[PDB]
Amino acid sequence: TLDVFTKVVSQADSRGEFLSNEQLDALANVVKEGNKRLDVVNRITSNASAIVTNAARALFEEQPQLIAPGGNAYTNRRMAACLRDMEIILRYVTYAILAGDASVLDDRCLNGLRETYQALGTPGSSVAVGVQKMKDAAVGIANDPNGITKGDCSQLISEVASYFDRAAAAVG
Amino acid sequence: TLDVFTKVVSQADSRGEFLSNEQLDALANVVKEGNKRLDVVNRITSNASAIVTNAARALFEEQPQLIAPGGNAYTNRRMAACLRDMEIILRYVTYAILAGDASVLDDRCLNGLRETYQALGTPGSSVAVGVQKMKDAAVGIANDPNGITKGDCSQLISEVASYFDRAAAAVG
Amino acid sequence: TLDVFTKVVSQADSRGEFLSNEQLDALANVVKEGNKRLDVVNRITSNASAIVTNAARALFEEQPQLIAPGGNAYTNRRMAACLRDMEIILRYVTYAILAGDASVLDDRCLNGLRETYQALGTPGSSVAVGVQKMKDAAVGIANDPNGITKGDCSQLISEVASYFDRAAAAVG
Amino acid sequence: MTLDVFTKVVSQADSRGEFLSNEQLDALANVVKEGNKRLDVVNRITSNASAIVTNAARALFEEQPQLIAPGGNAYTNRRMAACLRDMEIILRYVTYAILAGDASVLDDRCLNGLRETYQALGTPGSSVAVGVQKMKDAAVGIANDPNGITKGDCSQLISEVASYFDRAAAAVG
Amino acid sequence: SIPLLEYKPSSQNQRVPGYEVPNEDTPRIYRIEDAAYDSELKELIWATYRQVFSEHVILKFFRQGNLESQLKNRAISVRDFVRGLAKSEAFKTLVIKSNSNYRLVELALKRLLGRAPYNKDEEIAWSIKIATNGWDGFVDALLDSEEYQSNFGENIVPYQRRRYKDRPFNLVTPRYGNYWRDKLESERYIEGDIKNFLELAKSIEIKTVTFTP
Amino acid sequence: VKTPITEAIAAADTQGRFLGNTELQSARGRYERAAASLEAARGLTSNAQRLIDGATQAVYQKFPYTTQTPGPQFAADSRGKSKCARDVGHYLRIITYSLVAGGTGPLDEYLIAGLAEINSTFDLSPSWYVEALKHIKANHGLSGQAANEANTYIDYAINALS
Amino acid sequence: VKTPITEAIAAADTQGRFLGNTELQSARGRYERAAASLEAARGLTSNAQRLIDGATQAVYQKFPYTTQTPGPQFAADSRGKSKCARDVGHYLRIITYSLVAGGTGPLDEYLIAGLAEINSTFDLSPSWYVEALKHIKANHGLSGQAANEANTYIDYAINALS
Amino acid sequence: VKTPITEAIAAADTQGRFLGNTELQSARGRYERAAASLEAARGLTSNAQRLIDGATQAVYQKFPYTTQTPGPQFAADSRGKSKCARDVGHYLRIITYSLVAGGTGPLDEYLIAGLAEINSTFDLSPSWYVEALKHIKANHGLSGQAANEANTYIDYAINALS
Ligand SMILES: *[C@H](C)[C@H]1/C(=C/c2[nH]c(/C=C3N=C(/C=C4\NC(=O)C(CC)=C4C)C(C)=C\3CCC(=O)O)c(CCC(=O)O)c2C)NC(=O)[C@@H]1C
Ligand SMILES: *[C@H](C)[C@H]1/C(=C/c2[nH]c(/C=C3N=C(/C=C4\NC(=O)C(CC)=C4C)C(C)=C\3CCC(=O)O)c(CCC(=O)O)c2C)NC(=O)[C@@H]1C
Ligand SMILES: *[C@H](C)[C@H]1/C(=C/c2[nH]c(/C=C3N=C(/C=C4\NC(=O)C(CC)=C4C)C(C)=C\3CCC(=O)O)c(CCC(=O)O)c2C)NC(=O)[C@@H]1C
Ligand SMILES: CCC1=C(C)/C(=C/C2=NC(=C\c3[nH]c(/C=C4\NC(=O)[C@H](C)[C@H]4CC)c(C)c3CCC(=O)O)/C(CCC(=O)O)=C2C)NC1=O
Ligand SMILES: CCC1=C(C)/C(=C/C2=NC(=C\c3[nH]c(/C=C4\NC(=O)[C@H](C)[C@H]4CC)c(C)c3CCC(=O)O)/C(CCC(=O)O)=C2C)NC1=O
Ligand SMILES: CCC1=C(C)/C(=C/C2=NC(=C\c3[nH]c(/C=C4\NC(=O)[C@H](C)[C@H]4CC)c(C)c3CCC(=O)O)/C(CCC(=O)O)=C2C)NC1=O
Ligand SMILES: CCC1=C(C)/C(=C/C2=NC(=C\c3[nH]c(/C=C4\NC(=O)[C@H](C)[C@H]4CC)c(C)c3CCC(=O)O)/C(CCC(=O)O)=C2C)NC1=O
Ligand SMILES: CCC1=C(C)/C(=C/C2=NC(=C\c3[nH]c(/C=C4\NC(=O)[C@H](C)[C@H]4CC)c(C)c3CCC(=O)O)/C(CCC(=O)O)=C2C)NC1=O
Ligand SMILES: CCC1=C(C)/C(=C/C2=NC(=C\c3[nH]c(/C=C4\NC(=O)[C@H](C)[C@H]4CC)c(C)c3CCC(=O)O)/C(CCC(=O)O)=C2C)NC1=O
Ligand SMILES: CCC1=C(C)/C(=C/C2=NC(=C\c3[nH]c(/C=C4\NC(=O)[C@H](C)[C@H]4CC)c(C)c3CCC(=O)O)/C(CCC(=O)O)=C2C)NC1=O
Ligand SMILES: CCC1=C(C)/C(=C/C2=NC(=C\c3[nH]c(/C=C4\NC(=O)[C@H](C)[C@H]4CC)c(C)c3CCC(=O)O)/C(CCC(=O)O)=C2C)NC1=O
Ligand SMILES: CCC1=C(C)/C(=C/C2=NC(=C\c3[nH]c(/C=C4\NC(=O)[C@H](C)[C@H]4CC)c(C)c3CCC(=O)O)/C(CCC(=O)O)=C2C)NC1=O
């Protein structure tokens, strides 16, 4: 579990020198964009369950053979696997957005997902489409201004689109 | 853990259609041969400990190097391994006879026996021979009529000879 | 005549979908870097006439038979002919940097130019030795900083030189 | 159970089943204003945590010399260490209760079985109370003095700390 | 003393919730407080032997009389009872003479915690503690772990948590390791070899004379 | 899956002992029960198109708003009503599965595990399928011992919905 | 209960160490936040009779069958509508509790624990209270940053219902 | 490492739930604390050569025998005094690390873990570095609230030595 701060700390520990001035200048900018980071993370967990069901319908339409019999997500028990576990991507993504680093995302939700499926028979490609259907809606939920002050966070939202693309490409 | 019934159920679940008429005609025959299934299974467990010791002496004569020193079954602890264990084949075989299916036999007593011996040094072939010495005596115990009504069960006894041959060939 | 703004419309019309949010974040960077280009473009057009003769101080000095009797730049209207349209390269390269996409460049300097240049009898390869000499002088002026606030202009400059390389490829 | 000053009012207002009254929100707004003084007092104790354990230990083991004398309950180096280690555990659960502003965390961890556990142990309860009462006059005195800080009178807040040690002392001896 | 080596956890069938509501092939995970009888406690005392040792090593000589008596009395909690079998020198000769340190991590997680190890780097992580704390100290740190005490609870026999399609662990892991087997082949006593006569051949003195012409 | 044959097997496995007469008597209780249960399954498979037509129309008359309210969850559009006959057509399979298997195994493994988990998410009210099964409970037309056997699995599914 | 003061306490308890600067910075994040949250609670307590009247009438117009269908679960009789204002009157207490406590503690301990457990039994559809809270989300009349903080708890309850 | 951002993360991980408002308020508390802590780190990095010269000479005047006694452990030879400025030069890095990280993470992971373990072996008395840090505590020259934040990590290291 690493931060943006402890990323710089563990990197400066390996060289064994003091923290340089521009690194403190860069981390002072993260303090200024710190309140926008709580704007984006609070907006996802408020719309957490609404974006799980909405991305599930768009997945199970466009691959109909899954909930069809013989499919990997056919029975009601497995189905509650491939639906409730779509939160677990979002659980570890919004951890990484609030952390600002992809270390927590890597060793919990990324380290064995492409591992565990060969023994399970779950198709890797189907999951990728699913997380990639979360990404265009999770970015779109945090994009629109309604009752918040207007700001610019395109340099910060691209981190969120990178986090889903890190989660997608490591499996499929 | 599967039956003959749940074999048809899980097969009919994958196609997603109702149960056909001849499948119910075939399962009605299993009801009629259900009382012959009870007698054969019951007989084995009555002669369980007598067929473990009798197959052990015929094994340890015809391969004398096992209980000879340096052998894999030389010491008593090891010896009480190879002897008691011989019940565990019979424990999972008579489960499969009463189940009428080889699913319980496969994932408990067959799934790692050919696995576990390379790390153990036990000879796989010798174990296979021992189970094949159970098979000609277990069939011969259930074959002879003494104080039971005469019937025909050659189509059912061949399932038992198939179960030991499934247990034998998966190891050696 | 296409643009950066209009070409990301035109392929988006061909697929018939609404413009995605990461295309708008792409165009937001185009607006962001827009101010520098106007500044960059103005320096080329203000030194437009100074580039052409300084390229003609080497286009003819390196291949000196061209103005010597017999070459196709020999007589005086023939000489004024390769200053009449040495600048038309600069007239449309500056249109390409303004639009930000080379689709207005390829209709005028790249479309039928290689056809006339074997119909007339002019050396086609002797143009692209000196259009490279324009690019060596164009990016020297556009990068040089005098009385201007400093920001990285690496992205704009590399693909300014890509327009000259497209201008040399379809003539040679 | 772990309770706040806020969840004290919440669980009390839950039992009556009515909305939160206006003066309760007026009282909790005052706790927000004294919230920065609460971090002043809690940060000053844990910075002087190990210095006040050793200093209260010497004043205890002088004035009752029979403890580290042979036959005493804190004689050998093992029991001694346990007693020494423990004196932090009062301070661990006291400064939890100061930052909580409530004595619920102090009660069910460090108070619920201390007067219980000593009859089976043979440790003297009265002596322990003295040890904690020697912490209290030094912990109040550490947070009292002002060096390089804004001066305000929280005397209404320091009396909560003197109440917390007196709650911890009187429940054992 | 020193905090443990930091290990990354992999994806594992028990690490997450799974929505199986009681399946049949799942264990019968026993409790001490149900019993109220002579009868129930003999079955419960047998299933804990079946977990920690294994069925094959469940012989009467190994079994402890004092421990069995305690469960009936109820003086000792079943979680306090498993400490008897893991720190039993009848158990210790069977598994600690024959298994390396990294296998000793894996076997204790596979039986006592009833879980597969996550990765390789965490058997390295638990390894330092065992060498310093002993075998008893590593077992003591495993049973007083927060993970063991919350999920098994206080009085429930060890078992495997989630095995939708997963090998039984007794079958999956041998009592001893692949290393200790190779010693048994090395000390097999081959018959009719030149190697056992090598220590006799050097004791015999031989003098050789060569003539050149 | 759960079957009173395999219930006798998995119980004897944990004790590590042979199939005694305790586990053996559980088998013939399953066997002679099938003869009153297999023609209880034949009464449902022959009447397959009747009941899924009957229960679907019974739901609409019980809840008249579910045909009018606009939403994916409801049956306002055609693909809702196409998904209507799929769902109750999926219930009658498992009841015929669990009647033939003789236990509540297929009802456990294929229907009710996570059934209360999904209905919170897709806002499918379970009282919809309660009235759907209660039409099948009254319209099956089975008589005698076989009817009793087919009647419990309908009621076992209802208590799992609630 | 869960409070980011006590979240800092219970985390430092399991490690067995003093309140360092790690747990201390979690306190002033709760403190400052209260000044935008306490008048977020004052906006709800002053408008108490408005919202429970507003959300109850919003439920009936959204679901017109719940006033007509005969059953205890519904609001056909008078004691149903008496239990209607009790339920949404019970929701607004915990939102004002969890705004004042500053965490999702009282929402965890008093509302959503076993909330999906009871609604399967009494066949109370959770989509009833979804539309009830969404009326409060649009008509609470609060403004600014404080209102936004107050709102999350409305949306945190909705995701717990679904 | 320990950071009150990651303290909020690892706490929400074991419960297996999303980042609610409980963990979110722990973030802001770290954020606005940095603005009184980053120029608290700038006061130490600018005065780097002053303090390691000051604390090393303060140790020799406090303990005059440590310059005279013959031994590797002491500072009699030149390589002892070369290892003197290395050690206190290593302390000031972690204090600037733990001020910038905002928690006692780098003090835990890099300094005090096994710090009482090595000093028994190399017979380095911890009271040497107590007086070394107490010179830095009085002579770091920082003022205001930011200075106070820096001071706690100095006092947190002293209690770890004792
Ligand atoms: C010291 C001021 C007094 C004193 C103390 C003393 N304590 C013990 C032994 C133990 N004390 C505890 C205490 C706690 N456990 C908790 O969980 C908490 C709350 C966080 C507390 C306060 C425990 C568990 C033990 C025993 C085992 C262990 O510590 O690990 C002893 C040891 C006595 C003996 O014979 O063993 C002593 C001597 N002694 C005095 O005289 C003082 C009044
Ligand atoms: C989902 C988009 C796809 C899909 C999934 C599906 N998964 C399973 C079963 C399991 N999935 C896991 C996954 C994890 N465990 C972890 O610890 C983590 C990281 C935190 C993950 C991602 C596990 C352990 C299982 C086994 C059962 C369990 O959940 O405990 C199934 C069931 C398959 C079966 O045969 O039983 C399915 C269907 N299915 C799809 O179609 C999607 C493409
Ligand atoms: C010493 C000359 C070199 C060195 C040592 C060093 N090792 C580690 C980490 C570990 N060491 C072990 C070693 C053992 N484990 C065993 O069970 C046994 C036999 C009983 C041995 C010899 C293990 C498992 C580890 C992993 C972590 C652990 O302590 O439990 C470290 C710490 C490194 C780190 O934390 O990353 C060090 C310093 N390393 C050197 O630099 C010397 C060259
Ligand atoms: C953890 C609890 C918490 C939250 C949620 C929080 C949010 C928060 N967002 C703020 C500002 C802001 N937040 C945004 C966010 C955005 N504007 C846009 O148009 C974008 C689409 C979007 C980012 C994607 C902006 C633009 C501001 C302006 C003020 C600033 O820069 O902070 C501020 C400044 C102070 C104030 O508003 O009173 C707060 C409080 N503060 C807290 O303490
Ligand atoms: C439920 C399915 C199942 C089976 C069958 C199984 C077998 C199994 N037999 C083992 C050992 C053994 N297996 C044997 C058996 C034999 N060795 C011989 O010499 C004979 C040739 C042969 C018997 C015919 C013996 C003697 C041991 C003890 C060897 C040792 O301790 O090193 C071991 C390792 C130690 C143990 O726990 O006892 C396993 C895992 N485990 C399973 O989970
Ligand atoms: C679970 C405990 C249990 C057992 C063991 C059991 C067995 C059993 N086997 C029976 C019949 C029978 N069992 C057999 C079996 C055979 N005859 C042969 O010649 C073949 C070699 C062999 C089959 C391979 C036959 C032929 C009958 C005649 C009656 C019938 O069809 O059931 C019957 C009919 C009723 C009776 O005998 O009183 C019983 C009770 N019933 C039980 O409740
Ligand atoms: C608007 C875009 C555009 C361009 C650029 C263009 C070029 C162009 N240059 C031409 C001739 C020419 N082009 C050149 C140029 C050169 N020859 C040389 O010796 C030099 C190497 C080189 C100049 C660097 C010369 C000297 C002629 C006259 C050749 C002739 O009359 O045969 C001709 C044929 C006759 C003409 O109308 O003048 C065309 C069409 N036409 C276009 O419509
Ligand atoms: C159409 C009339 C027009 C022009 C010409 C124009 C140019 C222009 N260039 C600007 C900035 C700038 N322009 C440059 C350009 C460069 N710096 C380098 O070192 C590179 C070599 C070079 C690009 C190749 C840079 C770096 C800035 C910094 C400010 C900014 O990002 O806009 C700005 C910002 C506002 C200002 O300067 O007052 C202006 C006005 N604005 C106008 O309205
Ligand atoms: C000797 C008796 C005494 C005390 C106790 C005292 C404390 C004290 N702390 C203050 C401020 C403060 N105290 C803190 C302390 C902190 N905030 C955090 O979030 C951190 C976790 C923590 C430090 C670790 C802060 C942030 C302020 C803001 C005002 C200031 O800078 O002084 C002030 C400013 C004036 C006032 O509050 O009325 C007082 C009075 N003054 C006194 O006369
Ligand atoms: C094999 C056993 C089995 C069954 C029966 C089953 C049902 C089931 N029906 C669903 C949705 C649905 N179920 C229905 C059915 C209905 N809604 C109505 O309006 C009508 C009242 C009613 C039909 C009479 C509809 C329309 C949907 C789509 C709802 C949505 O997409 O939100 C869903 C969630 C999404 C899906 O994959 O399609 C499941 C899991 N799943 C199973 O594994
Ligand atoms: C403190 C948080 C809290 C809430 C909110 C809560 C609700 C709650 N409402 C209930 C029943 C009820 N809930 C309602 C409410 C409604 N039904 C309708 O028809 C309307 C659509 C809707 C109101 C808008 C009614 C009428 C009953 C009685 C139903 C019955 O008795 O079967 C019940 C079961 C019986 C009871 O004790 O009264 C609970 C537990 N319990 C809690 O602990
Ligand atoms: C990055 C943070 C960091 C620090 C600061 C650190 C200090 C440290 N200093 C050590 C020894 C030492 N430390 C000193 C320093 C002193 N002794 C004296 O006599 C003087 C009073 C004093 C200096 C002012 C000396 C001379 C040794 C060698 C002692 C020996 O070899 O026994 C040792 C043990 C052996 C070693 O690897 O060199 C450590 C671990 N280690 C760390 O990882």
Side-chain angles (χ1 to χ4, degrees), chain F residues 13-51:
Chain F
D13 208 340
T14 69
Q15 316 178 314
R17 66 198 316 166
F18 279 95
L19 284 179
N21 217 334
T22 5
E23 299 80 23
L24 258 159
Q25 293 175 15
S26 200
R28 219 179 91 216
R30 192 258 173 283
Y31 276 152
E32 64 164 13
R33 201 46 185 142
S37 120
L38 283 192
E39 318 72 299
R42 290 186 182 182
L44 289 187
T45 41
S46 30
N47 263 337
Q49 245 329 319
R50 196 182 283 165
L51 301 160

Side-chain angles (χ1 to χ4, degrees), chain E residues 90-149:
Chain E
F91 168 75
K92 178 138 46 188
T93 59
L94 198 69
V95 70
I96 293 175
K97 310 205 175 219
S98 67
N99 304 55
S100 68
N101 205 304
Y102 311 102
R103 188 173 169 92
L104 271 171
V105 178
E106 178 190 307
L107 260 179
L109 302 179
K110 275 184 172 163
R111 299 182 172 193
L112 302 184
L113 292 203
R115 68 156 165 212
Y118 289 81
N119 291 73
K120 196 46 162 61
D121 302 61
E122 46 161 26
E123 315 163 3
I124 324 179
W126 278 107
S127 45
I128 167 56
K129 198 164 189 175
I130 298 187
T132 77
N133 289 13
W135 164 250
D136 284 21
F138 159 72
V139 163
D140 211 341
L142 198 50
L143 295 174
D144 290 9
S145 90
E146 59 90 20
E147 192 268 343
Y148 178 78
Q149 169 184 170

Side-chain angles (χ1 to χ4, degrees), chain C residues 59-60 66 72-73 77-79 81-82 84-86 88 91-92 108-109 113 116-117 120 122-123 126-127:
Chain C
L59 230 140
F60 303 104
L66 286 178
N72 213 355
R77 57 137 168 155
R78 274 183 167 156
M79 169 70 214
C82 59
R84 80 78 167 281
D85 55 59
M86 202 69 58
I88 301 184
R91 260 190 62 242
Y92 284 111
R108 287 98 151 88
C109 332
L113 193 61
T116 70
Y117 272 17
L120 289 159
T122 172
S126 274
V127 177

